Design a binder for this molecule. Structure first.
Ligand SMILES: *[C@@H]1O[C@H](CO)[C@@H](O[C@@H]2O[C@H](CO)[C@@H](O[C@@H]3O[C@H](CO)[C@@H](O)[C@H](O[C@H]4O[C@H](CO)[C@@H](O)[C@H](O)[C@@H]4O[C@H]4O[C@H](CO)[C@@H](O)[C@H](O)[C@@H]4O)[C@@H]3O)[C@H](O)[C@H]2NC(C)=O)[C@H](O)[C@H]1NC(C)=O
Ligand code: FAD
Ligand code: NAG
Ligand code: NAG
Ligand code: NAG
Length: 581
């Protein structure tokens, strides 16, 4: 079985040499490892801090048990600094084990707006990173199943052109076996009354309106986590090696040439218990957006002003750990009548004007006039280092909103006994950072600051979207099922205005756990860390391939793009491999 093939003893890899070392056995790391070992000549070693969890039981395998695993040893639970918005620390849920955060997530499978991905090439200069290319790799990864008569009847719509059927990641409609709740169709009807679209397939390139969606699970409803999809079918390959239960602490760099070269990694569990392993070709970082940047910083790749005071010699000065972008989530929950019983999830991808409603003119006024003031403030807070380059990101977001009308907020609906909305502003203007606070990697002492709500439009947009969730819960056809709000319930008057909501939100939100950007893929002059093939600037044989590299947020759930991203980067690595013979 797979468990017997996994390595646990540090001495089984210590001192050996492999072609590629992948730090982190998560979504991008395992997709890359499987892809690279298709060629029998390439040897790959994956080093994962956690272990095999995919067959544990329903706590991992059933998507309906979402949330039960939090706080366990399968959850890294990274703590933020004390946030300025509320003076509290927040926990960042993140999977710890083979498959990473795909072990503990909600399984939602959707794609962004075409214009968002196209801007990676046209605005950020990443040649080849456009919707057409990324979507093609997304389809290649995908193994979707169309909905059946019962599922269609509940509200599903599936455009066959927009889904791959021959790929690797099993995706299909979640179906617990009970009846589907009629609240999903009631919500659709309520938004249809306001001229909002319904049933568009959210994998097609224009996520807008209210629709149901596929989930990453097999037809028998077992979670399609990355280790089940990419590692389980290929674990017997003799060139694929997986070491578990150990942390990668830093990259080993040789400086006896013009340009520094990555030759291996140092791994371990504590400062007194560390081992080295070497790479013939390249070291690939895939430890997650909260960790990959810190691995660079421990290794002497990052800002001198951060590293020098810690007693670390700066080999390459780069803006590692800046440009962190995560979203904020708040909840609106209502009791329903018995008539609404049944399973089902749906989401409203709402545009800027749909979110703000009659406040749209005022919200547009801010968008048009404060971009520069906002960029200066975020830079003064340490979220980014170049005001001009940050202004360009903001102008790009303004373009998406005013010219492309992309979805600005997401209202995610859960039923199964209640009407529960989790809401989030998809496009934050705040920028945060993550930096180490000690030289020892195994101390795990770092400062992670997303700077939630320190940009005024993020606060206004979140409050507007959450107020919209309360409004739509007791509107049109939903009024038949509404049996009283429970959250906020007594904690915020039912007729609260927008300014009241803005005062309530900072005390009642959670991270959305979608942090991207800490090793941003954009030109060096725009504040980038990696180039368009994910190579770290100024270093040979080192790439960062995970959620740290997307330079922007997106109007969707990110698994469809991250699986595509890893496949596209793996092709680039395969070409370079043939070049270095
Ligand atoms: C997160 O925590 C940080 C602190 O760790 C918070 O930041 C601190 O916030 C406090 C305010 O709550 C602030 O203290 C004020 O400093 C001013 C000087 O800059 C003072 O003028 C002010 O004193 C007045 O209020 C006091 C409190 O009631 C009185 O005891 C005092 O005599 C003063 O009273 C006069 O003024 C008040 C109105 O100011 C008036 O009602 C009275 O009649 C009287 O005329 C405070 O001492 C700190 O400077 C802030 N910074 C630091 C580092 O401490 C931050 O707000 C927290 N964030 C959140 C979201 O909670
Ligand atoms: C609670 C939650 C809900 C989500 N819901 C959705 C959803 O519904 N739909 C969706 O599309 N996406 C969702 N996501 C996001 C998606 O799961 C992640 O964006 C994706 O898994 C990130 O992939 P990655 O390869 O960057 O990192 P990960 O998958 O996190 O993997 C990084 C890996 O590195 C390991 N690691 C960490 N530190 C070290 C170290 N020092 N050395 C070695 N290994 C290390 C970690 O244990 C982990 O396995 C959610 C995420 C979370 C946390
Ligand atoms: C399906 O999606 C394609 C986009 O590739 C679109 O052209 C078509 O109109 C959509 N709808 C149907 C009914 O196929
Ligand atoms: C959004 O609202 C603003 C202000 O009313 C308006 O100028 C714009 O045309 C609206 N609609 C769209 C789709 O942008
Ligand atoms: C700041 O970013 C701008 C815009 O990308 C770029 O022209 C400039 O060179 C950057 N400045 C520095 C000093 O890096």
């Amino acid at each position: 079985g797979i468990e017997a093939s996994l390595l646990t003893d540090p001495k089984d890899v210590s001192g050996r040499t492999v072609d590629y070392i992948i730090a982190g056995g998560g979504l991008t790391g395992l997709t890359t490892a499987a892809r690279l070992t298709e060629n029998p000549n390439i040897s790959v070693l994956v080093i994962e801090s956690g272990s095999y969890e995919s067959d544990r039981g329903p706590i991992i395998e059933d998507l309906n048990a979402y949330g039960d695993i939090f706080g366990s040893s399968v959850d890294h639970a990274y703590e933020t600094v004390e946030l300025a918005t509320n003076n509290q620390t927040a926990l960042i849920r993140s999977g710890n084990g083979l498959g990473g955060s795909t072990l503990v997530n909600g399984g939602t499978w959707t794609r962004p707006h075409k214009a968002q991905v196209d801007s990676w090439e046209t605005v950020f200069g990443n040649e080849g990173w456009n919707w057409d290319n990324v979507a093609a790799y997304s389809l290649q990864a995908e193994r979707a199943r169309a909905p059946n008569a019962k599922q269609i009847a509940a509200g599903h719509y599936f455009n066959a052109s927009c889904h791959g059927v021959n790929g690797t990641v099993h995706a299909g409609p979640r179906d617990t076996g009970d009846d589907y709740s009629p609240i999903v169709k009631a919500l659709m009807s309520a938004v249809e009354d306001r001229g909002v679209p319904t049933k568009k397939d959210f994998g097609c390139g224009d996520p807008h309106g209210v629709s149901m969606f596929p989930n990453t699970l097999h037809e028998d409803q077992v979670r399609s986590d990355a280790a089940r999809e990419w590692l389980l079918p290929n674990y017997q390959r003799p060139n694929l090696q997986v070491l578990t239960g150990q942390y990668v602490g830093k990259v080993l760099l040789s400086q006896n040439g013009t340009t520094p070269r990555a030759v291996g990694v140092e791994f371990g569990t504590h400062k007194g218990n560390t081992h080295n392993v070497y790479a013939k070709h390249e070291v690939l970082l895939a430890a997650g957006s909260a960790v990959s940047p810190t691995i660079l910083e421990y290794s002497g790749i990052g800002m001198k002003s951060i590293l020098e005071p810690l007693g670390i010699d700066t080999v390459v000065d780069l803006p590692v750990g800046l440009n962190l972008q995560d979203q904020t989530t708040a909840t609106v929950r209502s009791r329903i009548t018995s008539a609404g019983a049944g399973q089902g999830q749906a989401a409203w991808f709402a545009t800027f004007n749909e979110t703000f409603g009659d406040y749209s003119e005022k919200a547009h006024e801010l968008l048009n006039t404060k971009l520069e003031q906002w960029a200066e403030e975020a830079v003064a807070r340490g979220g980014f280092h170049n005001t001009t380059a940050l202004l360009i990101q903001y102008e790009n977001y303004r373009d998406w909103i005013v010219n492309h009308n992309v979805a600005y907020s997401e209202l995610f609906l859960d039923t199964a006994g209640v009407a529960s909305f989790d809401v989030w502003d998809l496009l934050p203007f705040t920028r945060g950072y993550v930096h180490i606070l000690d030289k020892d990697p195994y101390l795990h002492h770092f400062a992670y600051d997303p700077q939630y709500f320190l940009n005024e439009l993020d606060l206004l947009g979140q409050a507007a979207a959450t107020q919209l969730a309360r409004n739509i819960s007791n509107s049109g056809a939903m009024q038949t099922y509404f049996a009283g709000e429970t959250i906020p319930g007594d904690n915020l008057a039912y007729d609260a205005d927008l300014s009241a909501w803005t005062e309530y939100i900072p005390y009642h939100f959670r991270p959305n756990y979608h942090g991207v950007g800490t090793c941003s893929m954009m030109p060096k002059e725009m504040g980038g860390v990696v180039d368009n093939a994910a190579r770290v600037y100024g270093v040979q044989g080192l790439r960062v391939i995970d959620g740290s590299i997307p330079p922007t947020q997106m109007s969707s759930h990110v698994m469809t793009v991250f699986y595509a991203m890893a496949l596209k980067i793996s092709d680039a690595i395969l070409e370079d491999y043939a070049s270095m013979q």
